[PDB]
From a paper:
To bypass this, we engineered a bitopic nanobody, Nb5660, by fusing Nb56 with another nanobody. Examining hOCT1-Nb5660 with cryo-EM resulted in three slightly different hOCT1-Nb5660 conformations, each inward facing, at resolutions ranging from 3.23 to 3.28 Å. In these structures, labeled hOCT1-apo1, hOCT1-apo2, and hOCT1-apo3, but no metformin densities were detected near the central cavity (“Materials and methods,” and Supplementary Fig. S5). Consistently, Nb56 binds to the CTD of hOCT1, stabilizing the transporter in the inward open state. When examining the inward open conformation dataset, we discerned three distinct classes of conformations: two partially open and one fully open, with overall RMSD values below 0.4 Å (among Cα atoms) indicating close conformational similarity. The most pronounced divergences were detected at the intracellular ends of TM4 and TM11, with RMSD values range from 2 Å (between partially open 1 and partially open 2), to 3.7 Å (between partially open 1 and fully open) and 3.7 Å (between partially open 2 and fully open). The final transition from the inward occluded state to the inward open state is marked by further movement of the intracellular ends of the CTD helices, creating a fully open channel that bridges the central cavity with the cytoplasm. The extracellular ends of these helices remain largely static during this process. At the intracellular juncture of TM7 and TM10, W354 forms a critical interaction with N453 when hOCT1 is in the inward occluded conformation. This interaction is absent in the inward open conformation, where W354 is seen to undergo a significant side chain rotation.
Numbering used by the authors:
A (entry chain B): 3 to 120
B (entry chain A): 21 to 277, 330 to 520
């Protein structure tokens, strides 16, 4: 049961945090990640994280986004700062499929996301 | 720092791989007393002597016809033409009586080996498999026992004791007078070797973080490869097995002086279908690797060059596996690598008599294909499985592979007495069946 929280309305730039919550079995046995919808466009990729700790980032957002993993509250966090007017969309917390496709394009879970505007 | 770990990883390989060089079963034939005087009297050639006396079975059957039978002819009597003495006595040599080798055998080698030392051939040929069976039994027993010592005393104290016992056992085996002592020393050496290697790897994994886990794993693989390459050089200048054993054993003593539980993986129908396949693939690859290594070591016509070439070709597989991580999925490389290890066996079965140029290429291709498949399993294990890995992995996987490794030498060595190619069909079937199970890994109802 993926459930997202956070996301308000910044005037012009700033920093804010997004949080995703898991059940307890999804947390400890597979890979989580964050996607973007970009209304008026197609789906997008922003970050992943796995059990070991190796992280990947999109080319257009390298050096600006930071993802951290908790272990006591069973939640995963996303940190973003120095926003731009083009960064406005709804963010989906999804579990990708590793064995088929490319590794981050096939999904089996989602949580309907939440909306944040800049 | 890393020098001690690299030295330990390099020195672990000879313990597991030295069966190729320690016992190499050179060509032998039966010994008949009294023929030396007759041969030296009317000397004609030192290499064509066996063409007139020693029994031969070129087409086939030479295992128990030309290497375990002798002609009971009174060579002492001076009634021969020194050209075809058997023809003079009778025009038909097929009806002459045979018998066993009552005196012994003479071998054709400048060095020495265990087989040559203990006359371990003919009806005793099954005795060589005990050499690997005892080591693998020690590997099985050590894994379930070394964990108790670490908790009882500590991680630091156990390493010195295991290293000292291994160093003493190597020299004592090098100074063994009979066969039983050699087997006991082999068992002890295998047990302590697995124990200290496990302890060292656990300590190294504790010291190093998971950020460079891939890098340190690749460094360990290359350390194993370079340690295995240097073993070929040492055996070139030390033909005798006692000297080689002493030289291998010396450097060790030289440098010496709401929680994740295992019960959660078997109740969810999704996770229960993945772990079984992972164990099956690991067991299959572990069996085939040792099977092909022993098969190459038991029939190579050029041991040193083939060993060196295979060890060299083993290196780019890790680089390819690391490169192909972020470009494609994880079932395509696994399936391709598993399929590459079967067709090689089918081709090797049907190779017409030719030179060695094709054989080395095909063996290198098979070795690279096997090497690529093992790394992917380790990467997936590290990627998808929770914090508790080390203990359960090094226990369950080791105990799963050890039972297969106990039985592998008997099947490999004892199935060549009726047909020379039977283990190749087994390897081909295992490889082809291992590739058809990875296609069930993807989860259904997955839509982008």
């Amino acid at each position: 049961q993926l459930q997202e929280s956070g996301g308000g309305l910044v005037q012009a730039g700033g920093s804010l945090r997004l949080s995703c919550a898991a059940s307890g079995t999804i947390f400890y046995y597979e890979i989580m990640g964050w996607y973007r919808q970009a209304p008026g466009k197609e789906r997008e990729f922003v970050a992943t994280i796995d059990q070991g700790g190796i992280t990947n980032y999109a080319d257009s957002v390298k050096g600006r986004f930071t993802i951290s993993r908790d272990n006591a509250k069973n939640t995963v966090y996303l940190q973003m700062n120095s926003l731009k007017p083009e960064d406005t969309a709804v963010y989906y917390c999804a579990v990708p499929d590793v064995f088929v496709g490319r590794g981050w394009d096939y999904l089996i879970y989602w949580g309907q996301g939440t909306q944040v505007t800049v | 720092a890393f020098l001690i770990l690299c030295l330990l990883s390099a020195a672990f390989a000879p313990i597991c791989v030295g069966i190729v060089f320690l016992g190499f079963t050179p060509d032998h034939h039966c010994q008949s007393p009294g023929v030396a005087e007759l041969s030296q009297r009317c000397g004609w050639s030192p290499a064509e002597e066996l063409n007139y006396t020693v029994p031969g079975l070129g087409p086939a059957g030479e295992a128990f016809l030309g290497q375990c039978r002798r002609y009971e002819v009174d060579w002492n009597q001076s009634a021969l033409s020194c050209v075809d003495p058997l023809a003079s006595l009778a025009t038909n040599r097929s009806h002459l009586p045979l018998g066993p080798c009552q005196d012994g055998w003479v071998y054709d080698t400048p060095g020495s080996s265990i087989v040559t030392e203990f006359n371990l051939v003919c009806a005793d040929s099954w005795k060589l498999d005990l050499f690997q069976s005892c080591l693998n039994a020690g590997f099985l027993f050590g894994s379930l026992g070394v964990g108790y010592f670490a908790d009882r005393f500590g991680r630091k104290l156990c390493l010195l004791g295991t290293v000292l016992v291994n160093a003493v056992s190597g020299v004592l085996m090098a100074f063994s007078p009979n066969y039983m002592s050699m087997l006991l020393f082999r068992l002890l050496q295998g047990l302590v070797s697995k124990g200290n290697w496990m302890a060292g790897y656990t300590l190294i994994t504790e010291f190093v973080g998971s950020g460079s886990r891939r890098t340190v794993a690749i460094m360990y693989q290359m350390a194993f490869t370079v340690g295995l390459v240097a073993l070929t050089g040492l055996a070139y200048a030390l033909p005798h097995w006692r000297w080689l054993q002493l030289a291998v054993s010396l450097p060790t003593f030289l440098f010496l002086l709401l929680s994740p539980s295992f019960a959660d993986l078997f109740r969810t129908p999704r996770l229960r279908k993945r772990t079984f396949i992972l164990m099956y693939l690991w067991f299959t690859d572990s069996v085939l690797y040792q099977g092909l290594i022993l098969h190459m070591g038991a029939t190579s016509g050029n041991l040193y060059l083939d060993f060196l070439y295979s060890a060299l070709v083993e290196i780019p597989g890790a680089f390819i596996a690391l490169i192909t991580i972020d470009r494609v999925g994880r079932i395509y490389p696994m399936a391709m690598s598993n399929l590459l290890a079967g067709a090689a066996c089918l081709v090797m079965i049907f190779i017409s008599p030719d030179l060695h140029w094709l054989n080395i290429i095909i063996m290198c291709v098979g070795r690279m294909g096997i090497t690529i498949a093992i790394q992917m399993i380790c990467l997936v294990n590290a990627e998808l499985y929770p914090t508790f890995v080390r203990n359960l992995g090094v226990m369950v996987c080791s105990s799963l592979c050890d039972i297969g490794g106990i039985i592998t030498p008997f099947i490999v060595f004892r199935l060549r007495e009726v047909w020379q190619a039977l283990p190749l069909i087994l390897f081909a079937v295992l490889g082809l069946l291992a590739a058809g199970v990875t296609l069930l890994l993807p989860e259904t109802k997955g839509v982008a």
